[PDB]
Design a protein around this ligand. Structure first.
Ligand SMILES: CO[C@@H](C(=O)NCCOc1c(C)cc(C)cc1C)[C@H](O)[C@@H](O)[C@H](O)/C=C/C(C)(C)C
Ligand SMILES: [Mn+2]
Ligand SMILES: [Mn+2]
Length: 284
């Protein structure tokens, strides 16, 4: 048997960031200035995005190494926060539209945007950690779902097949291809197992802004005409559900849960379209 439905916990105090680490402009503001930026980045921006991406990947991997029964989601946030700040990076989530922590922790039925808190991870859980770094005036965004203890076969396979859907989508990225191939590959692969691909939350372009206005759909919609071109940077971040797509948001305004409480898994990388294919910017 696995645990029952989750409920929210208490948050730790706000974690500070040294003043010499520049903040994204949206920290301390009610909204973010994003969504109208170019989709192809300059070579100087891309080089800085490699640095941001590798730092985010390191924070993700260090917090992921700590996932085990008995650990709180707050303790994962502390690890990610300190990794970023020791690397001179600001955690992009912290202060984005008032989000109170440095990463998102989404267990089990939480589709995305779970808030690190007193919640204790237990055996059988699947834990998504989502970390973004802001450094050099650019962002790097990545997430992964990590098993805690011995996970039930249905949940283990959900995580492994979500990871594989993500990698197959990444491996389609090439200049001249339609962006819509990403969602076609994810949803074709998920539908083999009878999983449902979340639609309402998407991948996105990323650069000097966190969400630049480019949308990357994870389901199949061949009417989108956008093509991949060298220098475009975006995330692929599919959420895949064992149950129905219907969802609720907690009173915290962030945490998104499946209405049937069936579990869901996600992986994310920030990608660069190169002249021949793709480069993952959020690798160690
Ligand atoms: C699944 O979650 C992704 C997500 O919301 N996509 C939808 C992005 O919608 C847009 C689009 C499509 C355009 C603009 C201009 C702005 C937004 C938020 C995130 O990008 C996630 O990867 C990120 O780590 C977390 C960010 C906050 C918790 C701080 C929000
Ligand atoms: Mn993310
Ligand atoms: Mn993202």
């Amino acid at each position: 048997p696995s645990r029952t439905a989750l409920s929210p916990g208490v948050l730790s105090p706000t974690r500070p960031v040294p003043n010499w680490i520049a903040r994204p402009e949206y920290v301390g503001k009610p909204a973010a200035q994003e969504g109208s930026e170019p989709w192809v980045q300059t070579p100087e921006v891309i080089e800085k995005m490699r640095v941001a991406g590798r730092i985010a990947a390191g924070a993700l991997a260090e917090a992921g190494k700590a996932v085990a029964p008995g650990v709180t989601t707050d303790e994962l946030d502390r690890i990610a926060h300190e990794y970023l700040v020791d690397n001179g990076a600001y955690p992009s989530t912290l202060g984005y539209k008032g989000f109170p922590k440095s990463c998102c922790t989404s267990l089990n039925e939480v589709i995305c945007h779970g808030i690190p808190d007193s919640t204790v991870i237990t055996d059988g859980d699947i834990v998504n950690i989502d970390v973004t770094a802001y450094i050099g005036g650019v962002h790097g965004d990545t997430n992964a779902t990590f098993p805690a203890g011995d996970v039930a076969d249905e949940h283990r396979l959900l995580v492994d097949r979500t990871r594989e859907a993500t990698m197959r989508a990444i491996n389609t990225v090439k200049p001249g291809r339609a962006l819509s191939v990403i969602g076609r590959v994810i949803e074709s692969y998920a539908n083999r197992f009878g999983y449902n691909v979340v639609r309402d939350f998407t991948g996105h372009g990323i650069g000097t802004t966190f969400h630049n206005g480019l949308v990357v759909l994870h389901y199949d919609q061949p009417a989108v005409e956008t093509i991949m071109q060298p220098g475009m940077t975006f995330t692929i971040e599919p959420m895949i559900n064992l149950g129905a797509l219907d969802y609720e948001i907690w009173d915290d305004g962030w945490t998104v849960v499946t209405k049937d409480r069936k579990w869901t898994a996600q992986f994310e990388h920030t990608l660069l379209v190169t002249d021949t294919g793709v480069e993952i910017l959020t690798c160690l």
